[PDB]
Amino acid sequence: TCPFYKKIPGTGFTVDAFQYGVVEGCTAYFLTHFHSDHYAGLSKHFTFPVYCSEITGNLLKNKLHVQEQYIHPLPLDTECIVNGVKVVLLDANHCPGAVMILFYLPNGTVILHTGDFRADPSMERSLLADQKVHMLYLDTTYCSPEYTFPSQQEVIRFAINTAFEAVTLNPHALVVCGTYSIGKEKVFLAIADVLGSKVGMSQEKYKTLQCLNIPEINSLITTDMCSSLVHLLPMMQINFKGLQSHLKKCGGKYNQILAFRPTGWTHSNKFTRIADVIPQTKGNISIYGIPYSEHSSYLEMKRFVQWLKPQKIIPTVNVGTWKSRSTMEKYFREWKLEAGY
């Protein structure tokens, strides 16, 4: 059944709750972003109102074929009224079109639902600064102190410098980047920009990117693989067998592959700095796992919460085990005692 952490009290609303059939009492279904564990269940047969960003609404219409009459896009940073309740959508710093949602309950309670987010100090100067938030529905993906990672800018610097050096040493090297969802487009777009190439990809993936309102996108991507030396493939193909196979397909235009796997976290983070990352190599193929995260680190999460000072926290991730739930609740209490709220 629909879990309680997907329901908004004092409303008929649910958040990211599309795989439970008709939720009894739900008058509006919000969708924070277009990732499959969140939209699971949506299709052309859905006949309830869906509230989301413009970009998520483009994806619902073009990729899932949801009928336009049931898609309600909202502008960001704007007080809107939905079924009699004031709401605001804020940028979540996750993937394209991802939002956090502020609900202003008729009884005076304010609730923030982060969706999936990567906390940032810039959030401390949005509309969140203007009133108190009582309850926080929190993306706790990396809520444990082992989870450190570098800034996105540091990671993209490494990738740009690595790729440019390799292709300048060998003009017959191919760059390959893995993907399995929207998100992390800066990785392949930044590499292609330093090399003066467009990024080549499948027709399905090109369609997906053309929904994202990225400026000048027609200048940066293409479905002509032959004219490109940065290729995008399914994350599943980013291994030695998959890459050897791909190289055979390029007809001797290339003699070396340099590949990137933008992972979340990996246990080489606790020891190794970004400057010191190395690839796995077999023959003329090298694979780099780079820690490009679109979720908060532990310290970023902690700073956001200690700034916001909520009265109650409801985790939305890692809630399935008692050991995880108990651990998270311990950190929340530490943060509260340290900061004095």
Ligand code: NI
């Ligand atoms: Ni997500």
